[PDB]
Subunit: 460 residues, 4 copies
Amino acid sequence: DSRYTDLGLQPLAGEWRHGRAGRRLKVSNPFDGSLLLEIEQADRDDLDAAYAKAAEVQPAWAALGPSARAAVLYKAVEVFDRRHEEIVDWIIRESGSTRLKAEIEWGAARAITLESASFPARVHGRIVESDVPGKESRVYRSAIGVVGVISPWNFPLHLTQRSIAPALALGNAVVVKPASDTPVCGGLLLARIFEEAGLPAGLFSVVVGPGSEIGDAFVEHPVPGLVTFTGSTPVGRNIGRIASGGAHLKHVALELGGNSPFVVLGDADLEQAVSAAVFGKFLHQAINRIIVEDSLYDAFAARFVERVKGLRVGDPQRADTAVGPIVNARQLEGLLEKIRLARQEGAKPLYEGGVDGQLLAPHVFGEVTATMEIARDEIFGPLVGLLRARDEAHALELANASEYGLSSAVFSRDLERAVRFARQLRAGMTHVNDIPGLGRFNGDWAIEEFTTDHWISVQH
Amino acid sequence: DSRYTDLGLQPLAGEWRHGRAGRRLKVSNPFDGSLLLEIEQADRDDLDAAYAKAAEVQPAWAALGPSARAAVLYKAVEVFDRRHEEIVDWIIRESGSTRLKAEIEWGAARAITLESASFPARVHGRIVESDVPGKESRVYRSAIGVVGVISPWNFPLHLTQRSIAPALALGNAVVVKPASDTPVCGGLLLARIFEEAGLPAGLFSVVVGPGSEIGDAFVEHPVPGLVTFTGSTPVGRNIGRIASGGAHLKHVALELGGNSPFVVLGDADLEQAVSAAVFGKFICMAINRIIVEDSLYDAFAARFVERVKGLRVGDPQRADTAVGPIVNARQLEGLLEKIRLARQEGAKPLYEGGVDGQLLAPHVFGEVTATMEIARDEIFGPLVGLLRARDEAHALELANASEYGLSSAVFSRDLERAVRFARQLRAGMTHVNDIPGLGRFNGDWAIEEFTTDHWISVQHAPRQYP
Amino acid sequence: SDSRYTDLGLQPLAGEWRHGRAGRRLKVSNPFDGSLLLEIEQADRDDLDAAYAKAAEVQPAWAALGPSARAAVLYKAVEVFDRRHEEIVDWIIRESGSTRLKAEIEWGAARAITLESASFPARVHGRIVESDVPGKESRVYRSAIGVVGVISPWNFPLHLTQRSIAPALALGNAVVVKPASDTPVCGGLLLARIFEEAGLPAGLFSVVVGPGSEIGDAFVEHPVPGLVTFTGSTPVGRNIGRIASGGAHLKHVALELGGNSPFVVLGDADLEQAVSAAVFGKFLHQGINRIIVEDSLYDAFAARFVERVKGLRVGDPQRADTAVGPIVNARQLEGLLEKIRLARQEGAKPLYEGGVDGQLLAPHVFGEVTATMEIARDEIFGPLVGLLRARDEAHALELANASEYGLSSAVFSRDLERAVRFARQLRAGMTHVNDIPVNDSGLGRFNGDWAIEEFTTDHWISVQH
Amino acid sequence: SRYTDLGLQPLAGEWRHGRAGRRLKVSNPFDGSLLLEIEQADRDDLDAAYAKAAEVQPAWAALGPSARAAVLYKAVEVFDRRHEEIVDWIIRESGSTRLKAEIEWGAARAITLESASFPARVHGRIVESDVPGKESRVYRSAIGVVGVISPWNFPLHLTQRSIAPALALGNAVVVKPASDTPVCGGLLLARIFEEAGLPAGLFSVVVGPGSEIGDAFVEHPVPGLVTFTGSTPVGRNIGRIASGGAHLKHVALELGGNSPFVVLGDADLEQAVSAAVFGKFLHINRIIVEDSLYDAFAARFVERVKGLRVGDPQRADTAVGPIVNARQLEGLLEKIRLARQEGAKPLYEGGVDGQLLAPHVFGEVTATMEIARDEIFGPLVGLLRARDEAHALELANASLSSAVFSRDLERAVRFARQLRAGMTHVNDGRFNGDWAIEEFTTDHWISVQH
């Protein structure tokens, strides 16, 4: 039917209204610079109201039967399907993501939502044995209460929904703080979807405000039982201190992005390794460093560069666009700085595409070493370094030098060797020989995350 | 210090006494035929009393804390150590087991006892939400009640303890019916060990009786919530029929021995396979068929036969003895018939050993086919058939030919291929490149087997009931 | 689609919808008016062999698909449940003679089972285990059993069939269903149509409708099925159990056997709740045979119980107001007449006796019944109930536990602590405190844990590196 | 022989003196008599302990479950073996009563026995995939090295609570004990584990000047996890150091709190009084009673409190023993004062004789008084008056553990669930394999494409 309108309105304490901060925020398309919409920012009082209301209405939401809460999640899946193109179109225009990656982001969010609908049925308390005669110990598993979610600019919709959908399903309320560049895909859109899906008012608020005023207060506030953030390391690190530093001590769930290594061993299928690297780094769902055994390195570099030159940079609305615009000026300036820093540190430039406004074309460097910043620090854009490895042991040392490892990959025709190498990696996941709810986030992970246990021992 | 005496007395309904059947069972050594002991057998009043007593005292046992029940299991481990040789000697004398096998049986039984000590603390009830307003669901996990255990002649002590120890630890009571050839090993000794370790009287009864009198009644009885059996397929078939056929219906857990295939693919390390196969066969970790890809067949057959010749057939008390006597004459007669039929069916005699009383030497046959009896039927002795496979696809057909699969093994230097092959086998367990408490057994299985769920839904609020 | 299913007499056999080759015709009739619903060409033994063989053949490809693909089919099946709601409920009433009220309940339960099962595939887990042996790893793989043979009852044919079919299929098994001769449609045939519409590949779901004489034992005896499933009468279930282990090939059997279920009312009970719960469970839902009341509340319970029961309205099941409808078949009915007559001569005090008119058998309530009497000991599948007087709590426990076999139970008392203590001593798998002993999202009984245990098996592979 | 040379520190697999060149005296709180003297450890020592733990840990983790379990079993035998010796050290060092010391010993022994089964139970998983030919394997492995910060309250038992499962699950461990209780701080636990056949280097204890090595312990790069149970202020501090430092460290934080003891109108009064006295004094900070029952409870409570002996901890009769340290006592005396100035009614006041602090009971306490609201580490308790159950709930809520007494269990359980505490005892656990395995192991997903 009709596409959502008045997206500038904020869901605050059960009502859709303007924020009272007295300042306007412009939301712009990174590609052509066009004005998408304008938002009246929210002040600190707006934040307090949203947390209070979430706390007030949450018990009644938790009191509902599991099927009732699941009905909302199923209904949200249904809205995802009806507003497919509308959702994808918002992700492209606001975040600057290509249509290919927006479609993937749509699918991921829908899948999380469908998975979460089954979670209420799976929540289970425990009855425990006791040595004391006449004593029964019962453990009740209940919702935490209110969860505060901080959204990134990178994959706002999918990464927001990854916390939002399970938290809500398991009987919590949520308040979300999106990135200033991506308020709509930061949970304003998600809030509209959950409302049409029959979520009671007040359970989901979104606070869009100046980070100077509302920033630290979001974390420090006494109401939230848990604060979740997935994204940048410096941002996450700050969230860490504010949590510990504050008068109240808050549980925080931090998933911090890292430089993730892609390792190609000597016996690897070359063509398959090259395709997987290109899909991983540029086409995307990450990969920030590619390490190749010396015997394969020269041939890998040549073929990789050849494919990367073929990658189409342009308007993200097109289905054939591989590389689109960087989301904002700050991120762009950072990537341009990393390019110049790479040059001074003596990395060999293999391919350098032209920067055209927010469109940063692929940049590939070679002869990289573990100490260079391009190896050490995380990259959020089309810049990647190629490392030479002397042997398997050297490849392992290079891969583990990153220290912080969210993901990894290893390529080798010998599966036994690949798996044995993978096990020595200091990373949470490794993908072996990957050709282009089941995996990663799981119901058991979510239930533990967004519930708490109360041990109640009863003496007869 | 002194070993157990008066083993002829039966633990029946909380007392150690004679059976009232009025008939005596002779228990004798398979090697020399010397008489070990005589037991006054139990009648059907004895069985009823044993079951009744177990049902009566079991609640108090379950009501104890996990720590108290665990304490008994720990003390049983101490007895196992102090009476090590006594136990091993009884296995050898009574069952005719070689000292080498007896030591393995001892270690296996000891490990079961230790592990089981930890089980009580892991047992967990669950609390569930409800769509009905004002309803809460509590699920309690409790002991079944009384478990009836039938012990085989093959590995009496270990296989009995594998059921007995976890069931007792988890708050059940047990009644055991041992095989007529091995009553002491099948729980008469275990009851003495558990009694020494402080198990309250009446939780563990042993019923040694005429298979005519007590046999069907033991399975048919209304008291036991579960009946467990590990051993021969025809026996298990009989137990299964009586269980479902009888007036009273109970769950039955049947672990039935079968012809288990040992598969050697083309690329396999020949020397390792042969030694593994020899150590394997010469048991309910059984190897009954050896299937080799055509390229290695002749080389495998040659090496295998030759190590087999090296195995010494002798007195089981000797530590060096590899092969010992068959448990009873009827089992020996079946093996002798199996050897006879094999020649009849066209199997090529690779090696023929002498039968000297109960001492039956290894017999190895070659060029065996799937239709031959030696391949398809279960063997409980030192008789082996070797099968030739043209390709890997043929080897898979040959391995999955047997109706009953419990264990299997695959030998190949390519682990990916070996595991891929293994996944196609119709078997519960496969060993890859290994000479056949972390495998099976384990708490999860034990808790599932010997406890049950009781759903109790509590309504705290009134219901319209349309 | 828009139009109702037609040609419901065709059997799904080995990937094809055709007539059976037995040369015998089975007539499906409405229990109420006796009218002809449809005619079925019965299946012979060759049809049975073909259905099993096809199921074995196509099952690996179904298992080899991903969890999401299998779950999609079950999501589409719920989809069909909604579009053909009234069509399904009408079939239940006409074939089984179930009331509209009970038919709606059955529809809902079946829909919920189907929807819950869609979540099951992704939850299946194998295991990785550590070894004392150096360089050794144990990997445990969890897979579908293969083919499941499902025997379905006449009482709640649709729901109880789906209770096995939906989870088994979801987890990558194939199924063959042998429904009751009185209810073949609401057995496998309507469900097979639904699953085909939802995009289930051909050959994964067969239904075999045949004379119990030839193909009866053969269904259970056959070598391909890895599991045989049955819920219903104890005598029938006993038969299935014997054939299973008695036969040449040994399979697992899962038997949920119907039994005399005790409904206990202690002295402090909420009487109106207890009475309402007893009437509604015994009549209008079931799919509770002995009522045990403490002596203090006994006479009070009997009066109110008899009073409500007399009000229960016996008639045409299509009517929304009908509480009691016809007995399914003639054999079933005149088993019930015998139970009534035997109760009288064993000395049961007849509290209320309604008139039997054709298949319509009105409620019958007896009092002062004892444990030794047949009305207490044996299960009844119909509107016949006995009331027992218990002197104290201890006596009530004894009377309830005499049954041996305890699938479900109920206890009514305002003292929740005492009710639970009593409930724990019940020899039953489920007890309901202050509510009807009626099952059921994943909250009770069927759930992923149960389903995965029942419809998958483990393969341990130890690897030496 | 009893253990000797207990002053030696297990550092990088060598027992030896600290490099810091400063000496610590460890003294009995009762007599003030000097127990032993320790050479403090420097920051160079601390770096060595972590380095050694990291290098030797893989070999320990590479062993089979049975090998690691066997060490744990031997430690249990030592606990029985040196029962009296261990109990004596607890009384001596921490000032714990003989009654309380025995409980600590029994608890610690149970932890050690529990943990022997843990190696066997740890499992990886295999997960299904939509991608054709893809298998997902998840491996469970030890964290690596775990740093444990030990308190002085129950040093022995609370240390082992972390040490035993961590070690069993194939981790290595470094312990930094409280300065008042270095021996029961795992300096002694180290000898037991050594006697039980624990390989050298896996278990290190650093006793050093809190000024130098304090923050360096938490900030260090090597430890995968840091564990601490003790004061909120002390633990709170540890929090910042974690996220404040250059690298980010996982921390497991168990912070003590004011735990409310709630007595409803229908409670059996005898059980309430007996339970209250047994809990607080014979090791709960605040007692809340409904108005109707308040006065009767208050009367009987002080009666039993009057009867407790304050004396030498070695005696089996001694109910109350000495406060561990001078601040704790001076803070204890200060806390009494401010309840005095804030207008709490003192029901019973005991005399302080040296370290020995007799029971102090106050009445008519309010939520806004520091005594109720702020954690207490001694034999000082306040009684609060509740008009109704709703008022009683509000009192308890404003405040780790809790208790509710009511003869109606349904009512008691209803109330308990509305308490936001982790644990409630009704009319009167954690640890366990599930928690331990999760805490001291980590998951590695590995996807294999065939």
